[PDB]
Amino acid sequence: VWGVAFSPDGQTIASASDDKTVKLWNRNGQLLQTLTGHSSSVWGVAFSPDGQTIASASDDKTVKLWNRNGQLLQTLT
Amino acid sequence: VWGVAFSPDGQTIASASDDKTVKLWNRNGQLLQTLTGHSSSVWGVAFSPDGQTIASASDDKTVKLWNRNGQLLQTLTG
Amino acid sequence: VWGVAFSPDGQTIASASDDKTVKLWNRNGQLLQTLTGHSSSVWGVAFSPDGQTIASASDDKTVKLWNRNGQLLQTLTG
Amino acid sequence: VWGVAFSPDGQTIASASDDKTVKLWNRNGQLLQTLTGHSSSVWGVAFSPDGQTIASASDDKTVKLWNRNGQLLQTLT
């Protein structure tokens, strides 16, 4: 987990945003997804080794797992 | 902020809990193990290169090494 | 704490400086580049898989992408 | 950088210690080195890809590079 990361193919960038979301962009500047669901500040993001799943860590004391298409998969409490 | 980590194959997640334990989960959301032994807050977790050993660093001034099956291996002191 | 990073080949180090710049160094201690453009504190730096692109995240609410030769490529906004 | 890390061969563990040092141990519990030099709290450690160099990051606003034998190589200010 870092507050900002590149996908394993280098084409997607994830960052923790100050509004309790995670933003996903393409390297050309286009915003792809806004991951909404955490109830407090988000401080960390990580990609899985195949780049298909994104993890986020928050001051709400959960870790959430998402598909890169924006869908929430799991909440680890 | 060092209190969450992912195994290098992405199948296991480790997280420090407020009750001074470390939780290990599978990526399907199931809880696998609860690592109990630190006497103060756990601030850092890390996986070994094959994911089979977990290290936990605590305000009790120790680093503990655990197997992913939940067994305590070592307590490192400075 | 996210304000220092290492390239995947270990040859380049990135660090956020208090003057709102990102510094790039070689492992021999020499300063290679100073990335200037953020208007507030820089809190996170990261390298792409080949080390050729650097991302910087700032309290100015942007993420900037740079080539390792110092050129600004993109400013990402939420 | 993380506050605790395994070497790439899994045989050495590095951690930031509360006394402004970095400790290096073998997986069998033996303390190998104490890296002394930072003038404030040390919060992050990392190994190079070959495991021969250790980086440390501190509230003194420096990053230091060390050989695994304990010798200071560089201070990045």
Numbering used by the authors:
A (entry chain B), D (entry chain B): 6 to 82
B (entry chain A), C (entry chain A): 6 to 83
Direct quotes from the study:
Instead, we used glutaraldehyde crosslinking to assay the oligomerization state of the assemblies, and confirmed tetramerization for the 2-bladed construct. In the two 8-bladed propellers, the one formed by four 2-bladed fragments absorbs the symmetry mismatch to different extent at the four interfaces, leading to a slightly oval shape and an approximate two-fold symmetry.
Many folds, spanning all levels of complexity (fibrous, solenoid, toroid, and globular), clearly originated in this way. β-Propellers offer an attractive model system to study this process. The units are arranged radially, with their strands perpendicular to the plane of the toroid, and have a right-handed twist, hence the name ‘propeller’ for the fold and ‘blades’ for the repetitive units.
